[PDB]
Amino acid sequence: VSMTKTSVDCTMYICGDSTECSNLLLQYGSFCTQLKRALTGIAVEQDKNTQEVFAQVKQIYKTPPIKYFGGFNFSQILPDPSKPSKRSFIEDLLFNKVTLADAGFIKQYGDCLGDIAARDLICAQKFNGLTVLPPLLTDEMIAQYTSALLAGTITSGWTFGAGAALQIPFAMQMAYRFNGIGVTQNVLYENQKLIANQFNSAIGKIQDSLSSTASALGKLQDVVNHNAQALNTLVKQLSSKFGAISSVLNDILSRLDKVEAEVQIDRLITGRLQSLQTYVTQQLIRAAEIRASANLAATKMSECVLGQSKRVDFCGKGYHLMSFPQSAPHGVVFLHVTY
Amino acid sequence: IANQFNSAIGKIQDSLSSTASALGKLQDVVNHNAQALNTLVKQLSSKFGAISSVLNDILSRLDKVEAEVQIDRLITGRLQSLQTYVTQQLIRAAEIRASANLAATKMSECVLGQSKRVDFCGKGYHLMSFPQSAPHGVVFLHVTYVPAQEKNFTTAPAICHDGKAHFPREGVFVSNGTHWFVTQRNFYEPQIITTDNTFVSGNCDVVIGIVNNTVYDPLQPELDSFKEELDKYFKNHTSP
Amino acid sequence: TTDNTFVSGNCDVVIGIVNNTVYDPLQPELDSFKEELDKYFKNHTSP
Amino acid sequence: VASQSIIAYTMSLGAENSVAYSNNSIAIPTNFTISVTTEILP
Numbered sequence: 001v002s003m004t005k006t007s008v009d010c011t012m013y014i015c016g017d018s019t020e021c022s023n024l025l026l027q028y029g030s031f032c033t034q035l036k037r038a039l040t041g042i043a044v045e046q047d048k049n050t051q052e053v054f055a056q057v058k059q060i061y062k063t064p065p066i067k068y069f070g071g072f073n074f075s076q077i078l079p080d081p082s083k084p085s086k087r088s089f090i091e092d093l094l095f096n097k098v099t100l101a102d103a104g105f106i107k108q109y110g111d112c113l114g115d116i117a118a119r120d121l122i123c124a125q126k127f128n129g130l131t132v133l134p135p136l137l138t139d140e141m142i143a144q145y146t147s148a149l150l151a152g153t154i155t156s157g158w159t160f161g162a163g164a165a166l167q168i169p170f171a172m173q174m175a176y177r178f179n180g181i182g183v184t185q186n187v188l189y190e191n192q193k194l195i196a197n198q199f200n201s202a203i204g205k206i207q208d209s210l211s212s213t214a215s216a217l218g219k220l221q222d223v224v225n226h227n228a229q230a231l232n233t234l235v236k237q238l239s240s241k242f243g244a245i246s247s248v249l250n251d252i253l254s255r256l257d258k259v260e261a262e263v264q265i266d267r268l269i270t271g272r273l274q275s276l277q278t279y280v281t282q283q284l285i286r287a288a289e290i291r292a293s294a295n296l297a298a299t300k301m302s303e304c305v306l307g308q309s310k311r312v313d314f315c316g317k318g319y320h321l322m323s324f325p326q327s328a329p330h331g332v333v334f335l336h337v338t339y
Numbered sequence: 340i341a342n343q344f345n346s347a348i349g350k351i352q353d354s355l356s357s358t359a360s361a362l363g364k365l366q367d368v369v370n371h372n373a374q375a376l377n378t379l380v381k382q383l384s385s386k387f388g389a390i391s392s393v394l395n396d397i398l399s400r401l402d403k404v405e406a407e408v409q410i411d412r413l414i415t416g417r418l419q420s421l422q423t424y425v426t427q428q429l430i431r432a433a434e435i436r437a438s439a440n441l442a443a444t445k446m447s448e449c450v451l452g453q454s455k456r457v458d459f460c461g462k463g464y465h466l467m468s469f470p471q472s473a474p475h476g477v478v479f480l481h482v483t484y485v486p487a488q489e490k491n492f493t494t495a496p497a498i499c500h501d502g503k504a505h506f507p508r509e510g511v512f513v514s515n516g517t518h519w520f521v522t523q524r525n526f527y528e529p530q531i532i533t534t535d536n537t538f539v540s541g542n543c544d545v546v547i548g549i550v551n552n553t554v555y556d557p558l559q560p561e562l563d564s565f566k567e568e569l570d571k572y573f574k575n576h577t578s579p
Numbered sequence: 580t581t582d583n584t585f586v587s588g589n590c591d592v593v594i595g596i597v598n599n600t601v602y603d604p605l606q607p608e609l610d611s612f613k614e615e616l617d618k619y620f621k622n623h624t625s626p
Numbered sequence: 627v628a629s630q631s632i633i634a635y636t637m638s639l640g641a642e643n644s645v646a647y648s649n650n651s652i653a654i655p656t657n658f659t660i661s662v663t664t665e666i667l668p
């Protein structure tokens with residue numbers, strides 16, 4: 001649904017706080033501002049994507065304290081009050097599957113100096129003006145929207161999508177879903193114990209699959225891995241000489257004077273400015289892929305969670321009954337229920 | 340329904356006449372294309388390490404083997420300025436395309452049809468939509484039925500009568516607390532439970548929460564009025 | 580039955596049509612009312 | 627005496643709403659509103 005927001009101090013990346021490098025960098029005009037603007041454009045869009053996927057509910061809906069829904073057992077996908085972040089059991093698995101390289105929260109500079117800079121790349125990134133920004137909605141704040149979409153669904157079916165939420169008994173809501181796939185509603189009520197046991201065991205297999213397998217959330221982990229690889233690549237290009245006598249700006253300024261130093265510094269400006277223009281082009285291209293995925297996820301949320309879909313294979317393999325959203329780091333998981 | 344529609348169209352004119360920035364999704368396209376050309380024309384002022392950015396000053400002051408190392412700096416930097424503009428415009432074009440493909444799909448599914456897709460044609464159940472053009476864009480006026488003034492009722496999944504279990508053909512069973520009815524699902528319009536409103540399946544012990552009520556048989560009262568007619572013939576027919 | 584089905588045309592336009600009875604729920608109750616009507620006429624032989 | 631300032635706050639997501647769910651209760655709309663809404667696309 002989103003990717004890590006990044007901001008870059010163009011000036012500090014290109015010039016390591018050298019003033020004569022900064023005075024040479026002004027010869028190139030607006031390119032540093034264009035890079036900053038483009039990255040700000042990408043960063044502001046990650047919140048837009050996340051808002052459009054999750055913030056579809058008017059109200060933060062709640063379930064009653066009596067957790068009985070015709071024999072269907074949502075306890076593993078509903079929020080768990082015992083956790084300090086109120087995610088569900090299944091959401092709290094998904095947060096263990098995807099492991100982040102930074103999340104944009106405070107580093108107290110005590111974190112950065114000493115030993116940690118030898119073992120965490122984030123410091124090399126930060127000391128070169130590359131900054132991961134935090135998302136506007138926290139993981140608790142996304143879990144609220146997800147528990148409201150889910151509480152609205154199980155207590156009121158599709159009705160909270162169109163209007164105000166209207167309560168209906170869950171077995172009668174499921175009978176509507178059966179009518180909607182062209183199965184007469186007595187086929188639900190005459191088999192309700194079986195249908196609930198099939199569903200309860202099918203949710204059991206989701207927990208077992210997520211608990212056992214390593215790489216099922218690869219579609220989310222690959223977003224983290226590509227945004228981490230791109231920043232590690234961008235900080236690597238600081239070591240490149242680009243035809244200068246050293247890549248280290250302070251060597252040139254320790255050893256040359258203010259006319260032949262400049263033809264070294266200008267090579268490093270030219271190559272580092274190309275390294276940012278490459279990174280920002282790659283991130284603008286990636287951001288379009290993530291946007292397209294967020295627009296799909298908001299369409300899936302609208303048509304599979306807030307409704308029942310007649311579209312074949314759009315809400316899983318089978319005839320669609322209903323779907324349940326669960327949040328994940330930088331994404332959404334839909335549990336699609338199909339006859 | 341006409342007055343609700345006519346007043347809802349009245350609010351579109353009042354909103355568009357009153358608010359400054361609702362068409363921001365279109366104005367931002369104009370502003371980005373204007374900002375990009377103003378940026379590209381600004382990069383003509385940049386020296387790129389030449390003695391000047393003004394090409395004629397270099398040609399007024401230097402000669403045809405050491406003017407060229409200034410001119411080549413400006414060629415290198417200005418060529419990069421275009422290569423950056425064209426890349427940004429190719430990326431913007433791919434996003435405008437995706438929006439035009441969505442707008443053409445909204446046109447086909449919301450204007451040329453009625454859509455079952457939830458939230459695809461506005462907030463509610465879709466009735467119809469009207470296209471209006473705008474500079475570089477389209478506005479759809481989506482018309483939606485939104486339900487209102489709900490009441491609570493007691494309900495049941497089935498009705499039990501002659502030991503047989505009855506289900507709604509279309510609709511849902513409801514009670515006001517003393518009587519039972521069938522109503523359509525999206526508007527309260529209650530009706531007597533009948534063998535025309537319902538279908539049978541099995542018996543009253545398979546279904547959880549089934550309730551006892553009579554189910555009326557519309558054939559039976561007119562057949563019994565035809566039995567009282569048969570009796571009025573027979574009683575007079577004792578006289579011959 | 581005549582409630583499970585609808586009619587259109589005769590049995591010679593449709594390829595692969597099969598012969599079977601179609602039940603009419605009105606007919607057996609009307610004949611139970613005919614044998615009841617008949618028993619009233621048989622009793623009415625007495626007055 | 628009262629006075630404009632910059633404030634900071636944790637954002638609200640919406641109004642809180644327990645749905646009146648029960649084993650045998652249904653809500654049914656007795657009326658409707660036709661609503662017209664703009665959607666704008668470049």
Ligand SMILES: *[C@@H]1O[C@H](CO)[C@@H](O[C@@H]2O[C@H](CO)[C@@H](O[C@H]3O[C@H](CO)[C@@H](O)[C@H](O)[C@@H]3O)[C@H](O)[C@H]2NC(C)=O)[C@H](O)[C@H]1NC(C)=O
Nearest residue numbers: 067068069071072073074075076077089200201203204207
């Ligand atoms: C809904 O599905 C839930 C997931 O299967 C299920 O929770 C599971 O319930 C059993 C029985 O209570 C627990 O088993 C444990 O029971 C007690 C708990 O103190 C322990 O002393 C036992 O040693 C045993 O470990 C499961 O641990 C529990 N699973 C989870 C993940 O919580 C619910 O019971 C189901 N709800 C209904 C109404 O049936």
Ligand SMILES: *[C@@H]1O[C@H](CO)[C@@H](O[C@@H]2O[C@H](CO)[C@@H](O[C@H]3O[C@H](CO)[C@@H](O)[C@H](O)[C@@H]3O)[C@H](O)[C@H]2NC(C)=O)[C@H](O)[C@H]1NC(C)=O
Nearest residue numbers: 187190191192193194195196197198199200201202204339
């Ligand atoms: C429709 O498919 C159902 C499976 O999704 C199937 O339900 C399964 O039925 C078998 C018996 O036929 C049960 O097997 C157990 O039965 C008893 C214990 O209850 C034992 O004697 C057996 O050794 C075995 O443990 C399954 O438990 C049951 N599964 C579920 C989810 O209920 C239906 O029977 C199928 N119906 C038709 C009409 O085909």
Ligand SMILES: *[C@@H]1O[C@H](CO)[C@@H](O[C@@H]2O[C@H](CO)[C@@H](O[C@H]3O[C@H](CO)[C@@H](O)[C@H](O)[C@@H]3O)[C@H](O)[C@H]2NC(C)=O)[C@H](O)[C@H]1NC(C)=O
Nearest residue numbers: 492493513514515516517518519520521528529530531532
């Ligand atoms: C639940 O809905 C029922 C149907 O609308 C309703 O029953 C009806 O109640 C009214 C009185 O409120 C009766 O009106 C009759 O009043 C006198 C009685 O002698 C007659 O002279 C009139 O002609 C008129 O018919 C209805 O007859 C009665 N309908 C039936 C089928 O019994 C209940 O009152 C409603 N209950 C609640 C709790 O609102």
Ligand SMILES: *[C@@H]1O[C@H](CO)[C@@H](O[C@@H]2O[C@H](CO)[C@@H](O[C@H]3O[C@H](CO)[C@@H](O)[C@H](O)[C@@H]3O)[C@H](O)[C@H]2NC(C)=O)[C@H](O)[C@H]1NC(C)=O
Nearest residue numbers: 498499500501502503542543544547548549550551552553
């Ligand atoms: C819905 O209406 C049903 C028909 O009136 C009614 O079923 C009847 O219930 C009683 C009590 O359960 C049964 O009486 C028998 O109960 C046991 C044997 O099972 C004996 O102790 C009694 O002496 C007596 O034999 C009736 O036989 C039963 N009738 C039928 C046709 O099943 C339901 O109870 C009603 N339910 C509700 C919720 O209103």
Ligand SMILES: *[C@@H]1O[C@H](CO)[C@@H](O[C@@H]2O[C@H](CO)[C@@H](O[C@H]3O[C@H](CO)[C@@H](O)[C@H](O)[C@@H]3O)[C@H](O)[C@H]2NC(C)=O)[C@H](O)[C@H]1NC(C)=O
Nearest residue numbers: 587588589590591592593594595596597598599600601602
């Ligand atoms: C389905 O049931 C139909 C009604 O019983 C039956 O139709 C009847 O078929 C026979 C044989 O084709 C016809 O008999 C006539 O055939 C020719 C003239 O066409 C003459 O040589 C015979 O002497 C005789 O007149 C019946 O007239 C015809 N009845 C009707 C009402 O059309 C079908 O044959 C049955 N089909 C199947 C596949 O079971």
Ligand SMILES: *[C@@H]1O[C@H](CO)[C@@H](O[C@@H]2O[C@H](CO)[C@@H](O[C@H]3O[C@H](CO)[C@@H](O)[C@H](O)[C@@H]3O)[C@H](O)[C@H]2NC(C)=O)[C@H](O)[C@H]1NC(C)=O
Nearest residue numbers: 340341342343344345346487488489655656657658659660
């Ligand atoms: C369904 O919702 C309708 C609103 O969308 C509502 O219509 C409104 O009804 C009221 C009266 O109940 C009208 O108010 C006017 O009534 C008279 C003049 O006609 C005056 O005494 C009042 O002061 C006031 O001017 C509204 O004008 C009318 N709105 C529209 C658009 O017609 C229906 O009454 C609702 N129906 C049900 C069954 O709830």
Ligand SMILES: *[C@@H]1O[C@H](CO[C@@H]2O[C@@H](C)[C@@H](O)[C@@H](O)[C@@H]2O)[C@@H](O[C@@H]2O[C@H](CO)[C@@H](O)[C@H](O)[C@H]2NC(C)=O)[C@H](O)[C@H]1NC(C)=O
Nearest residue numbers: 064488489490491492493516644645646647648651653654
């Ligand atoms: C639908 O009813 C619920 C509560 O049940 C009602 O209880 C009786 C008083 C009687 O009206 C029954 O027929 C109903 O079944 C309503 O929820 C309550 O709303 C009030 C505010 O009006 C609130 O103070 C309570 O805390 C709520 N209680 C619960 C359990 O949520 C609900 O508002 C009704 N909805 C509609 C559309 O009328």
Ligand SMILES: *[C@@H]1O[C@H](CO)[C@@H](O)[C@H](O)[C@H]1NC(C)=O
Nearest residue numbers: 618619620621622623625626
């Ligand atoms: C027919 O008449 C006999 C007496 O002659 C009487 O016992 C019987 O009940 C009558 N049956 C009917 C259906 O009227």
Ligand SMILES: *[C@@H]1O[C@H](CO)[C@@H](O)[C@H](O)[C@H]1NC(C)=O
Nearest residue numbers: 066068069070647648649650
């Ligand atoms: C709904 O029915 C179940 C099963 O009988 C019961 O445990 C539960 O208490 C009922 N719900 C309410 C609101 O009483």
